[PDB]
Amino acid sequence: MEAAHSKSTEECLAYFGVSETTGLTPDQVKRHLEKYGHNELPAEEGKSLWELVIEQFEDLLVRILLLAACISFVLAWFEEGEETITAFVEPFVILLILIANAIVGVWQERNAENAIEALKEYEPEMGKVYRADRKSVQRIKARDIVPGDIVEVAVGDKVPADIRILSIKSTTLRVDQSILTGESVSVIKHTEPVPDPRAVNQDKKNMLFSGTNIAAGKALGIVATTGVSTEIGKIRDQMAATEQDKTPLQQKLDEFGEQLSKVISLICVAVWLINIGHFNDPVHGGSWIRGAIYYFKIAVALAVAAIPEGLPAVITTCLALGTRRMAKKNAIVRSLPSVETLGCTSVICSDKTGTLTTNQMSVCKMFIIDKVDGDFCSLNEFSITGSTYAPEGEVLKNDKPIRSGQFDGLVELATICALCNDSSLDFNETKGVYEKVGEATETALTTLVEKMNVFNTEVRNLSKVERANACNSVIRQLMKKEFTLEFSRDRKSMSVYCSPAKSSRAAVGNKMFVKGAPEGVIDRCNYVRVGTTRVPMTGPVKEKILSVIKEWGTGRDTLRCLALATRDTPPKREEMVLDDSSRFMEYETDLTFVGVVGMLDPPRKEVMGSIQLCRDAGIRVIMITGDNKGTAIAICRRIGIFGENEEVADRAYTGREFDDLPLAEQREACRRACCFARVEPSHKSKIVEYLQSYDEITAMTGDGVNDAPALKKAEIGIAMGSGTAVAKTASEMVLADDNFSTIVAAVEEGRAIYNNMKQFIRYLISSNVGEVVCIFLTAALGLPEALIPVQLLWVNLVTDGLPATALGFNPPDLDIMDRPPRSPKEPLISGWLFFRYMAIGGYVGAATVGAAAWWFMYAEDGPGVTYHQLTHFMQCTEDHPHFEGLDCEIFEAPEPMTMALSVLVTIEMCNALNSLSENQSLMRMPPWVNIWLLGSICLSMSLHFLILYVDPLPMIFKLKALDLTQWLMVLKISLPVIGLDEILKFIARNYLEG
Ligand SMILES: C/C=C(/C)C(=O)O[C@H]1C(C)=C2[C@H]([C@@H]1OC(=O)CCCCCCC)[C@@](C)(OC(C)=O)C[C@H](OC(=O)CCC)[C@@]1(O)[C@H]2OC(=O)[C@@]1(C)O
Ligand SMILES: Nc1ncnc2c1ncn2[C@@H]1O[C@H](COP(=O)(O)O)[C@H]2OC3(O[C@H]21)C([N+](=O)[O-])=CC([N+](=O)[O-])C=C3[N+](=O)[O-]
Ligand code: BEF
Ligand SMILES: [Mg+2]
Ligand code: NA
């Protein structure tokens, strides 16, 4: 029964045809289960461990690198006895690499959690219902609950389903709905209907929502909805219905392939066009047996040299190391991609309650009377440190620590806090954290008492569990609580009646300890306590008290204040009637005022500095909360989002004012406003959507169910370690630490990561261009193969893969976080740089092929074959006279390729150094600036002389150790590349905005 909030209590019973006294009959239960299904969320499952392998080989590059491996495989057996010794090595290694990078991607996906399986960690286990079955309440599986059921809930219980309240048993019912609505203060519920059908959760004051918990009281209600129809059920669907795009870097890597593929097939044809000459030379030798063998031997060499076979490894390795570093900050990164994406973050949307704040009522201010002298009244004001329920913090006076016990007024304040209180504090030994037990407001008082420790109780030698009630416990033994007059809306105060317990102060007689909203309590005070004695309440005194009360309840404070008072001479229990709260106020009269406490849902310590760092990095921080505006804004001020006295004219909006804005204005609002209060889950997602529409990489920070939609939608979702399950599964990152400032570090990390990735991506793709030129040139000049895939792979995976990683360790700039985020659309290579790699590439194809042909024409120990006898090395056998001189198999010599490869390797090493900086000269930015790179070079070159000496290698790689003189040539051919780039860089810096 949706809309049950607008219907009356009888209308809801009628609607389900159930009795409030007995509850559904087992027959009805069976019928409702039939018509409504169990109270749970369907298991969210998709893409098994095998479905990934499927989409794994969907990568265009892979398919091409695979479609090529098939060709190379056919060309393995078609090899006569001369090189059929390693004829199957190539077609295999190519595949072996397709398998490696295959599981490389699966490893970066398999490691994922389950959303719905985590949601059950939030979905209540059991529930309490009354069914015709038995008179007594029955605890059952919360999943077996059905609409129409009569449910009972009491303090500490987790509401099991969306429930229409029928009758409140306690004097009042307070409910903590922060996980769903984001409200920082428990909610006082009622049973009257809520007229407006368009009412939002924060307005449904006669409803109880599944997942929330009871802060105080006992109530009976009727289930309105269950399963996916519950408020949290809806939000879980919103979450499942949100789409996410690929990583901008991934979209960039895909487009690259989409284009690379068009180029490959474009070159395969461009070179094919230069083969019409076969249909002219009067000669035959292989129709459908060899009349197209040499073609597919290069076609594969093209696909191998055009693809950076080692990019996935370098990328995964870089990301993984990044994630490891993040972990050291207690930042658990779920998705490796977001590791880098975090660097382009331009906006950080952030939830308030539990995310920006601790969501743990904390008393940070209190005061008692110092002295009274006629019209003169001074107050002892103190502040308290600590923003959680942990009994950790100190009481200060004028910014300096003091012993509360040395103040008689404080001893009493603490005593009222410990006794006029129905809640307590606890240490969850499981979650390893202090939790409230009962009302947040009352627990704040409990931890206040533990901090004050007025009796200097020994607590250093205690365990976390015992430490939670040591002081409170000491005070609970001084007085015996006879009865308590629970809180009521009219009076707006609460009190307990106590009698002396110990035989130390049995002459003090019965006392009444009161607490409540300031005004009422004070107006009922005839006396004021000064230390241990008492003076009458006078105007001057009252005015001074209220004025300070006013200061805290507004302005820079905007704290929640409670006054603490005690009735020195309370009525006798006999002359009192305790079954009606309408009489309570009168018993809580003629009171002696003792003090006041100021409390609030505190911002996490590291937030203010965090936001200041973001501003310097050109990153906006927007608050998106479900809580009311007054509080939303008060925190914005306290953390730097708004100035202490700034006029939040058009910069703060409620979920409604927002809606009253036309989409245009709405959209614009997301770029101006920094605070959105009384918003709903979809409002958060919408806001995030607007931002992204402006091409802004947005992050979202949250803890509650109400944050899940926006967290998933965000390029980078960030969840608090102490937040809900849904929120954590919808995030790529989790601050198990709850330290909001780890975000700024993660961003910094991400920026250093992005720059380094850009650099090594460029490096690898760069040599790929030159490699393709070398293959092209040879396939064009008719010249023999200077480089073969067996060599291209080793270099693309090892020789270069190593320096590329060392570039991932490129030190970040000194102002890495003193500049704005770079655009997502920003291309990695274009404009000048496109030309630079265009030239470097060309220089490589020419150098490698030229180094080969050089050995084939000028090597003092090589054939002096003419350029013509090289371009026509094929017809060497038949037309032997034209090539009268040596052996026709010299065109398969390792020296030429080794010459070409050794030039390639050396050029890349040189290009590695050129890649340390996009436009900075090796003069301005020394090579040793990155020691790791220098190492990767020595290690790459060693892995080279290794491939030229260890027999098993030079054999399969078709190589042969070069002369100590041939190297001198490789050097002369290679080194200059440093000069070429040094020049291209120079042009960019000076005669360009480089
Ligand atoms: C891997 C090797 C090669 C040679 C390749 O075909 O790369 C092209 C290509 C697909 C792009 C180009 C290459 O295009 C050319 O070099 C022009 C044609 C001349 C070839 C003639 C044959 C002798 C990149 C490599 O080259 C230069 C030299 O500037 C730069 C850049 O790529 C990147 O920024 C990498 C993205 C991960 C891309 O223009 C890119 O296409 C895009 O959409 C981009 C935006 O991606
Ligand atoms: N709609 C309401 N109807 C009646 N009382 C309300 C309402 N809203 C808030 N209150 C009471 O007004 C206070 C906020 O107003 P300031 O700080 O600005 O002066 C609130 O403090 C406590 O109940 C609240 C409370 N609590 O959880 O919210 C718990 C209490 N307790 O048992 O410990 C006591 C409250 N109290 O007021 O005494
Ligand atoms: F929990 Be919030 F601030 F929406
Ligand atoms: Mg929240
Ligand atoms: Na996300």
Ligand 1 atom 16, closest CA: 838
- H helices then E strands: how many in the chain? 35, 30
Q: What residues does 479 pair with on adjacent strands?
A: 500
Q: CA–CA distance from 301 to each of 84, 307, 648, 872 (Å)?
A: 18, 10, 64, 20
Task: Dig out the tokens for 600 from the structure.
Answer: 């609030």
9 within domain boundaries: no
Angle between helices 976-989 and 894-914 (to 10 degrees): 30
Q: What share of the chain is helix, strand, coil (3-state, %, to 5)?
A: 45, 15, 40
* CA-based radius of gyration for the chain: 38
- Residues near ion ligand 5 (CB < 5 Å) are 714, 717
Task: Dig out the tokens for 818 from the structure.
Answer: 């003193």
788 within domain boundaries: yes
Q: Give the amino acid at 522.
A: I
- Assess whether 161 and 286 both reside in one domain: no
Residue 203 in contact with residue 650, Cβ under 8 Å? Answer: no
Single residue among 563, 585, 602 that ends a domain in this structure = 602
Burial environment of residue 6 by CB neighbours within 10 A (0 to 12, 13 to 18, 19 or more): middle
76 within domain boundaries: yes
Q: Which residue has the tokens 């050129």?
A: 914
- Assess whether 692 and 779 both reside in one domain: no
CATH code of 524's domain: 3.40.1110.10
Q: Which residue has the tokens 């428990």?
A: 186
CA–CA dist 929, 922 (Å, integer): 10
| Cβ 704 under 6 angstroms from ligand 3 | yes
Question: Does 281 appear as a known binding residue?
Answer: no
**Annotated catalytic, 351?**
yes
CATH code of 201's domain: 2.70.150.10
Task: Dig out the tokens for 329 from the structure.
Answer: 């900050």
- Residues near ion ligand 4 (CB < 5 Å) are 182, 351, 353-354, 703-704
Give the nearest ligand 3 atom to 679 CA.
4
CA–CA dist 270, 774 (Å, integer): 15
Q: Which residues contact 564 (CB under 8 A, 6 or more apart)?
A: 412, 413, 416, 417, 420, 513, 514, 515, 594, 595, 596, 597
- Assess whether 765 and 684 both reside in one domain: no
- Assess whether 319 and 211 both reside in one domain: no
Way it was determined: X-ray
Domain extent, residue 620, equals 346-358+603-745
Q: Which residues contact 942 (CB under 8 A, 6 or more apart)?
A: none
| Cβ 215 under 6 angstroms from ligand 2 | no
| Cβ 390 under 6 angstroms from ligand 1 | no
Q: What residues does 342 pair with on adjacent strands?
A: none
> Residues 844-858, buried b or exposed e (16+ Cβ, 10 A)?
bbebbbbbbbbbbbe
| Cβ 253 under 6 angstroms from ligand 1 | yes
- Assess whether 443 and 331 both reside in one domain: no
- Assess whether 595 and 611 both reside in one domain: no
Compute the distance from residue 247 Cα to the ligand 5 centre, in Å: 11
451 within domain boundaries: yes
Ligand 1 atom 1, closest CA: 306
| CA-CA-CA-CA dihedral for 57, 61, 67, 69, to nearest 10 | -100
Helix (H, G, I), strand (E, B) or coil at 214: strand
11 within domain boundaries: no
CA–CA dist 518, 591 (Å, integer): 13
Question: Does 430 appear as a known binding residue?
Answer: no
- Assess whether 737 and 751 both reside in one domain: no
Separation of first and last alpha carbons in the chain: 65
306 within domain boundaries: yes
Residue 960 in contact with residue 954, Cβ under 8 Å? Answer: yes
- Assess whether 858 and 765 both reside in one domain: yes
Single residue among 240, 273, 296 that ends a domain in this structure = 240
Beta strands in 582-723 (DSSP E): 591-600, 620-624, 652-654, 675-677, 698-702, 716-720
Instruction: Indicate the top mutation candidate among 155, 178, 441, 491 to test ligand 2's pocket, ranked by most ligand atoms within 8 A of CB.
Output: 441
- Assess whether 577 and 511 both reside in one domain: yes
**Of 162, 351, 426, 601, which residue is the catalytic one?**
351
Single residue among 712, 745, 778 that ends a domain in this structure = 745
CATH code of 636's domain: 3.40.50.1000
Header resolution in angstroms: 2.6
Name which of 713, 749, 750 is nearest 824 in CA terms. Answer: 750
Question: Does 906 appear as a known binding residue?
Answer: no
Question: Does 799 appear as a known binding residue?
Answer: yes
| CA-CA-CA-CA dihedral for 300, 302, 306, 307, to nearest 10 | 10
Question: Does 515 appear as a known binding residue?
Answer: yes
CA–CA dist 407, 534 (Å, integer): 15
CA–CA dist 872, 281 (Å, integer): 13
Compute the distance from residue 695 Cα to the ligand 1 centre, in Å: 25
DSSP 928: G
3 within domain boundaries: no
| Cβ 487 under 6 angstroms from ligand 2 | yes
CA–CA dist 364, 341 (Å, integer): 39
- Assess whether 106 and 128 both reside in one domain: no
Instruction: Indicate the top mutation candidate among 443, 560, 599 to test ligand 2's pocket, ranked by most ligand atoms within 8 A of CB.
Output: 560
Task: Dig out the tokens for 297 from the structure.
Answer: 């031997």
Q: The sheet that has 698-702: what strands, in order across it?
A: 331-333, 733-735, 716-720, 698-702, 347-350, 620-624, 675-677, 652-654
Compute the distance from residue 225 Cα to the ligand 4 centre, in Å: 23
Alpha-helical segments (H) within 45-88: 49-56, 60-77
Helix (H, G, I), strand (E, B) or coil at 813: coil
Q: CA–CA distance from 582 to each of 488, 491, 513, 547, 585 (Å)?
A: 8, 8, 18, 29, 7
| Cβ 841 under 6 angstroms from ligand 1 | yes
CA–CA dist 692, 510 (Å, integer): 65
Ligand 1 atom 46, closest CA: 256
| Cβ 553 under 6 angstroms from ligand 2 | yes
Domain count, the chain: 4
Instruction: Tell me the ligand closest to 342's alpha carbon.
Output: 5
Burial environment of residue 950 by CB neighbours within 10 A (0 to 12, 13 to 18, 19 or more): exposed
| Cβ 442 under 6 angstroms from ligand 2 | yes
Helix (H, G, I), strand (E, B) or coil at 784: coil
| Cβ 182 under 6 angstroms from ligand 3 | yes
Helix (H, G, I), strand (E, B) or coil at 363: strand
Compute the distance from residue 383 Cα to the ligand 2 centre, in Å: 22
Compute the distance from residue 182 Cα to the ligand 3 centre, in Å: 3
| Cβ 307 under 6 angstroms from ligand 2 | no
Instruction: Tell me the ligand closest to 762's alpha carbon.
Output: 1
Instruction: Indicate the top mutation candidate among 360, 625, 683 to test ligand 3's pocket, ranked by most ligand atoms within 8 A of CB.
Output: 625
- Assess whether 98 and 154 both reside in one domain: no
1 within domain boundaries: no
CA–CA dist 344, 619 (Å, integer): 9
CA–CA dist 858, 438 (Å, integer): 92
Q: Which residues contact 168 (CB under 8 A, 6 or more apart)?
A: 189, 190, 191, 217, 218, 219, 220
Q: What residues does 167 pair with on adjacent strands?
A: 220
| Cβ 723 under 6 angstroms from ligand 3 | no
Question: Does 31 appear as a known binding residue?
Answer: no
Helix (H, G, I), strand (E, B) or coil at 601: coil
Alpha-helical segments (H) within 782-873: 789-794, 801-807, 831-855, 867-871
Name which of 413, 499, 407 is nearest 449 in CA terms. Answer: 413
Instruction: Tell me the ligand closest to 839's alpha carbon.
Output: 1
Compute the distance from residue 489 Cα to the ligand 2 centre, in Å: 8
Q: Which residues contact 451 (CB under 8 A, 6 or more apart)?
A: 384, 386, 391, 392, 393, 394, 395
Residue 848 in contact with residue 908, Cβ under 8 Å? Answer: no
Name which of 941, 922, 895, 936 is nearest 981 in CA terms. Answer: 922
CATH code of 781's domain: 1.20.1110.10
CA–CA dist 607, 52 (Å, integer): 39
Residue 564 in contact with residue 411, Cβ under 8 Å? Answer: no
- Assess whether 437 and 544 both reside in one domain: yes
Q: Which residue has the tokens 């009735």?
A: 567
Give the nearest ligand 3 atom to 181 CA.
4
Residue 225 backbone phi and psi in degrees, to 5? -145, 160
Residue 725 in contact with residue 321, Cβ under 8 Å? Answer: no
Question: Does 796 appear as a known binding residue?
Answer: yes
Question: Does 706 appear as a known binding residue?
Answer: yes
Helix (H, G, I), strand (E, B) or coil at 264: helix
Give the nearest ligand 3 atom to 357 CA.
3
CA–CA dist 440, 481 (Å, integer): 21
Instruction: Tell me the ligand closest to 712's alpha carbon.
Output: 5
Q: Which residues contact 406 (CB under 8 A, 6 or more apart)?
A: none
Residue 251 in contact with residue 28, Cβ under 8 Å? Answer: no
Question: Does 645 appear as a known binding residue?
Answer: no
Instruction: Tell me the ligand closest to 713's alpha carbon.
Output: 5
